[PDB]
């Protein structure tokens, strides 16, 4: 089943040997996801899932090498016998070609039927285990699928796509929003299908189309500006799915180096170009263990936002969240509050829907925990500045503005009384001397002939442009306004 030009690159005895298989599989016209997932899953298994080395399995061997930092003598790596890997490959292909026969699916020149796709879906879905928790670590790869029958939400969609490559269908692709996955197919790839569940609730919309989710302006579907992958992008997803977590507090060094390198490989090949979140991941990695001759983290977060604006209508939230994080961690309040505001600037043209819970919680943390903690910390650093810059006060206000606009036209209310206490308290974190140097203008003349300024977009935030700029923050009042 495997091509000879792939076999020769085996076996893999180090992170580098693995990179070779990826750099070489990435140079073909149809990179093999099934092969690359198996390798990755295999590697991630002995490195993160089961680190104790079996001495009774003459078929499984490990490779010694000098350990990275002065700490330690020798490190062991799971050698990827060609035999083992090829055996799994064949087992996967058997399940597929043996559970679906293209005998009855006339494809009119390079397209796949909605019935075929929905079939390959079902094949994989019914192949799934009955007894397991859907949120556990290290069940993203096909290695997991074939070995223990366990796959997580996104992993299922990846499987369905890999399965189709195995059947020859080269029009079926992975579709990636920021919190979901489904499949795109058809001529020009404009037909879509739901293949996996979402959130805790096993509620699936399988066989249904995304059109309804895109229509309702929810963030799960990104107002139609979600990623449409190609073989190369799907390989990136895979690299980003690598989970280096050994434990809640421990991480696998080798798996981190591995994933970091494979992202660069993908970057140099330019395949990260349309994958903002990938740029983010790569960034965060670097911050911790930088590599010589490579750009700074900060450089990367921006290349990530650039991508968002260019190829996705700047409709993605995470590239800002990523950046805001970097600063917050690096204690740069000004720059942080800026990005969090930029975030709300995107979310404002959305609606908070049932399935958008994940992003809700992401703002809730920022609004109610993270920010009130940079401010609390700031009120102690000057006493022994930024807590006295109006522009920061504007950033905070603009942030709340976006969250208010978001709520507008929404099914479920965003704001409740609990949001207020931390708005009130964060306002009080700024001296009236400053809260008044911010110009809350609505509009001088529009168009053009031939302190800092701030204009609200939300009717809620507009009605309060006065209470926010008082010398005494009317607690009771701002509450009853924020919620309505």
């Amino acid at each position: 089943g495997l091509k000879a030009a792939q076999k020769t690159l085996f076996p893999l005895r180090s992170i580098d040997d693995v990179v070779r298989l990826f750099a070489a599989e990435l140079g073909r016209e149809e990179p093999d996801l099934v092969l690359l997932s198996l390798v990755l899953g295999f590697v991630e298994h002995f490195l993160a899932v089961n680190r104790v080395i079996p001495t009774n399995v003459p078929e499984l061997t490990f490779q010694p090498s000098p350990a990275p930092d002065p700490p330690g003598g020798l490190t062991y790596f799971p050698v990827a016998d060609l035999s083992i890997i090829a055996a799994l490959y064949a087992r996967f292909t058997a399940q597929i070609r043996g559970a679906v026969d293209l005998s009855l699916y006339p494809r009119e020149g390079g397209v796949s039927s909605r019935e075929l796709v929905k079939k390959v879906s079902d094949v994989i879905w019914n192949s799934l285990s009955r007894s397991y928790f859907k949120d556990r670590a290290h069940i993203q790869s096909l290695f997991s699928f074939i070995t223990g029958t366990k796959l997580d939400s996104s992993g299922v969609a990846f499987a369905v796509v890999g399965a189709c490559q195995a059947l020859g269908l080269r029009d079926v692709h992975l579709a990636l929003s920021e919190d979901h996955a489904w499949v795109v197919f058809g001529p020009n790839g404009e037909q879509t299908a739901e293949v996996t569940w979402h959130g805790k609730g096993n509620e699936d919309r399988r066989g249904q189309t995304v059109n309804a989710g895109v229509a309702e302006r929810s963030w799960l579907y990104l107002k139609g500006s979600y990623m449409r992958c190609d073989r190369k992008m799907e390989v990136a997803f895979m690299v980003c799915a690598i989970n280096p977590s050994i434990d809640l507090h421990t991480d696998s060094l080798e798996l981190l180096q591995l994933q970091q390198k494979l992202l660069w490989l993908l970057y140099d090949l330019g395949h990260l170009e349309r994958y903002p979140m990938a740029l983010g991941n790569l960034a965060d990695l670097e911050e911790l263990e930088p590599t010589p001759g490579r750009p700074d983290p900060l450089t990367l977060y921006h290349k990530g936002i650039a991508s968002a604006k260019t190829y996705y209508r700047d409709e993605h939230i995470y590239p800002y969240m990523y950046l805001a994080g970097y600063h917050c961690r690096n204690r740069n309040v000004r720059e942080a509050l800026q990005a969090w505001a930029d975030t709300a600037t995107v979310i404002q043209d959305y609606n908070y829907c049932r399935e958008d819970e994940e992003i809700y919680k992401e703002f809730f943390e920022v609004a109610n925990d993270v920010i009130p903690n940079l401010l609390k910390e700031a009120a102690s650093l000057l006493e022994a500045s930024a807590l006295q810059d109006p522009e920061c006060f504007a950033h905070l206000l603009r942030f709340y503005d976006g969250i208010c606009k978001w709520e507008e036209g929404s099914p479920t209310p965003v704001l409740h009384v609990g949001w207020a206490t931390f708005l009130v308290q964060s306002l009080g974190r700024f001296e009236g001397q400053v809260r008044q140097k911010v110009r809350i203008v609505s509009g001088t003349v529009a168009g053009t002939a031939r302190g800092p300024v701030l204009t609200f977009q939300s009717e809620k935030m507009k009605g309060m442009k006065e209470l926010l700029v008082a010398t005494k923050i009317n607690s009771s009042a701002i509450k009853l306004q924020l919620t309505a």
Partner: peptide, 9 residues
């Protein structure tokens, strides 16, 4: 991290 959507921040 047990499981978060791939490439999430």
């Amino acid at each position: 991290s047990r499981w978060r959507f791939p490439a999430r921040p």
